[PDB]
Ligand binder design. Structure first.
Ligand SMILES: [Mn+2]
Ligand SMILES: [Mn+2]
Ligand code: NA
Ligand code: NA
Length: 327
DNA sequence: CATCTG
DNA sequence: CAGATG
């Protein structure tokens, strides 16, 4: 956690680099398990050889661990942090819509920068276009103080369209969190479930309302259950307009809301722990449901849930206010 | 995993 | 349809 800090970090830059710039999924993948095991490793790695001894640690990595330990640096890392082509790829990638792949295409055409991008708005696609337009806003975190206003808006319009909708804003926003990255809303309706063969209007209606009133500005992607958009809190009394924010809306069969809701509320760590305990208490948990564990090795059958309460109970545990769901 | 692009 | 992105 700090005993093998550099090592794990350098290794990460390496892995990261393989995948992003080059294509080296194997290699990239190699660096990964590698930092993971050393990450768990209980002592102070005093040398390459020492390391090698670990699984996932071959000669090539050991080689590296040496030079890094031998000198505060690594040539390879040094050579990579320089190289403009690498850098460009890490940058283009910041735009929502541009992945590695595309980063590579663009650079190999000379687009390496924002302007580059602007001058060639033709080559970019709609998502990427939005992305480029809101690059700035996009990186701006979302302060809880806005979160609450947003939340307030969304819940009110959903209510209006149908009293039966059930909306929930998950995310750390849900866990306390002073600011957040994007607005994550979980949605269901009674008339929508596991079996109940579809109902897309279910999602489409609300989507409309939000735009109706301008909360929603652009559509990144709009499927029948998931929607990736852009929204914005109305600018009050002109002098101060709000940054454009990322927002996601998702339909869920009522029969699996809370596991979902639980799940999205995180944190990853709280999930895991809960999940493990679930297992002890003879259970199974995932995104959508909780199941009774047979002894034959495994087994299923959807345990019925009516709240997040229902779940804990099942695994016979302490109801956790979302706040303390931290770890 | 759900959506898009081409 | 594969393949990319989130
Ligand atoms: Mn979030
Ligand atoms: Mn999001
Ligand atoms: Na080994
Ligand atoms: Na991106």
């Amino acid at each position: 956690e700090t005993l093998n800090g550099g090592i794990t970090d350098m290794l990460t830059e390496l892995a990261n680099f393989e995948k992003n710039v080059s294509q080296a999924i194997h290699k990239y993948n190699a660096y990964r398990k590698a930092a993971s095991v050393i990450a768990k490793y209980p002592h102070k790695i005093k040398s390459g050889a020492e390391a090698k001894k670990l699984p996932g640690v071959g000669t090539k990595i050991a080689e590296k661990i040496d030079e890094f330990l031998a000198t505060g640096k690594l040539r390879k890392l040094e050579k990579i942090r320089q190289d403009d082509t690498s850098s460009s790829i890490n940058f283009l990638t910041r735009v929502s819509g541009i992945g590695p792949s595309a980063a590579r295409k663009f650079v190999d055409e000379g687009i390496k920068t924002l302007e580059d991008l602007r001058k060639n708005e033709d080559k970019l696609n709609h998502h990427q276009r939005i992305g480029l337009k809101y690059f700035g806003d996009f990186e701006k975190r979302i302060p809880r103080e806005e979160m609450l206003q947003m939340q307030d808006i969304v819940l009110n319009e959903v209510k209006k369209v149908d009293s039966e909708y059930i909306a929930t804003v998950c995310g750390s926003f849900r866990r306390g969190a002073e600011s957040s990255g994007d607005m994550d809303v979980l949605l269901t309706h009674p008339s929508f479930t596991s079996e109940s063969t579809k109902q897309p209007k279910l999602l489409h209606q609300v989507v409309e309302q939000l735009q109706k009133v301008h909360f929603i500005t652009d559509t990144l992607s709009k499927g029948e259950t998931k929607f990736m958009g852009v929204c914005q809190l109305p600018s009050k009394n002109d002098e101060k307009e709000y940054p454009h924010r990322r927002i996601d809306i998702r339909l869920i069969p009522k029969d699996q809301y809370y596991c979902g809701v639980l799940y999205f509320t995180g944190s990853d760590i709280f999930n895991k722990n809960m999940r493990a305990h679930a297992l002890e208490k003879g259970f199974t948990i995932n995104e959508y449901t909780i199941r009774p564990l047979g002894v034959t090795g495994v087994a299923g059958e959807p345990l019925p849930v009516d709240s997040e309460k229902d779940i804990f109970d099942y695994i016979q545990w302490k109801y956790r206010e979302p706040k303390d769901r931290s770890e």
